[PDB]
Amino acid sequence: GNHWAVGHLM
């Protein structure tokens, strides 16, 4: 679906 919380790596 939507990419709400994805890819939170600095």
From Swiss-Prot:
<protein>
    <recommendedName>
        <fullName>Neuromedin-C</fullName>
    </recommendedName>
</protein>
<feature type="modified residue" description="Methionine amide">
    <location>
        <position position="10"/>
    </location>
</feature>
<comment type="function">
    <text>Induces an itch response through activation of receptors present on mast cells, triggering mast cell degranulation.</text>
</comment>
